[PDB]
């Protein structure tokens, strides 16, 4: 039921026709520059955000470096180059330098989780947590415990070609 929101998408991203998938293109599309659009960081949000309750979705991930995904607070900064950090309201996993990371700050946390293909995200706004699990055995990857203070959106980022993220039906 989640779909990517094209009005938020950085113009270099290419969204799938069914709005489930995202990869990085080779040029910027000519798109209107709405306040909601990430104009520099290679990000896109889902069209649905959450202010309460518990929510699950699953994300199919490419094998090559370049992606990061999780959740963002609605007030995440959209304009100019911004850090990809929890302080900026991004709580995410990332594949970079051949390693899986939970994107903590100032140092990321390397995950010795083995190869990932699909990840379940469990967002719990009632207790204040977002957790990630590898779907094959639901092994726990990481949990951020956060007193979320605003609406929270699923977040996706792809900053190199050769990889992808896809919301799974």
């Amino acid at each position: 039921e989640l779909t990517l929101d094209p009005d938020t998408a950085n113009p270099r991203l290419i969204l799938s026709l069914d709005l489930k998938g995202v990869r990085l293109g080779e040029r910027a599309q000519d798109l209107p520059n709405h306040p909601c659009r990430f104009d520099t960081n290679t990000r896109v949000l889902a069209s649905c955000g959450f202010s309460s309750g518990r929510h699950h979705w699953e994300v199919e991930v490419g094998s090559k470096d370049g992606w990061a995904f999780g959740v963002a607070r609605e007030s995440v900064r959209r304009k100019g180059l911004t850090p990809f950090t929890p302080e900026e309201g991004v709580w995410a996993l990332q594949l970079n330098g051949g390693q899986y990371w939970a994107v903590t700050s100032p140092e990321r946390s390397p995950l010795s989780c083995g190869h990932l293909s699909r990840v379940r995200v469990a967002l719990d706004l009632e207790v204040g947590a977002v957790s990630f699990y590898a779907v094959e055995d639901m092994r726990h990857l990481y949990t951020f415990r956060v007193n979320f203070q605003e609406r929270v959106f699923p977040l996706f980022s792809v900053c190199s070609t050769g990889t992808y993220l896809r919301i799974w039906p």
Binding site: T40, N41, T42, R43, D65, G66, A68, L81, F84, Q94, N96, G97, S157, C159, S160
Partner: peptide, 7 residues
């Protein structure tokens, strides 16, 4: 590295 600067 630098290649994730725009993440």
């Amino acid at each position: 590295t630098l290649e994730a600067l725009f993440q």
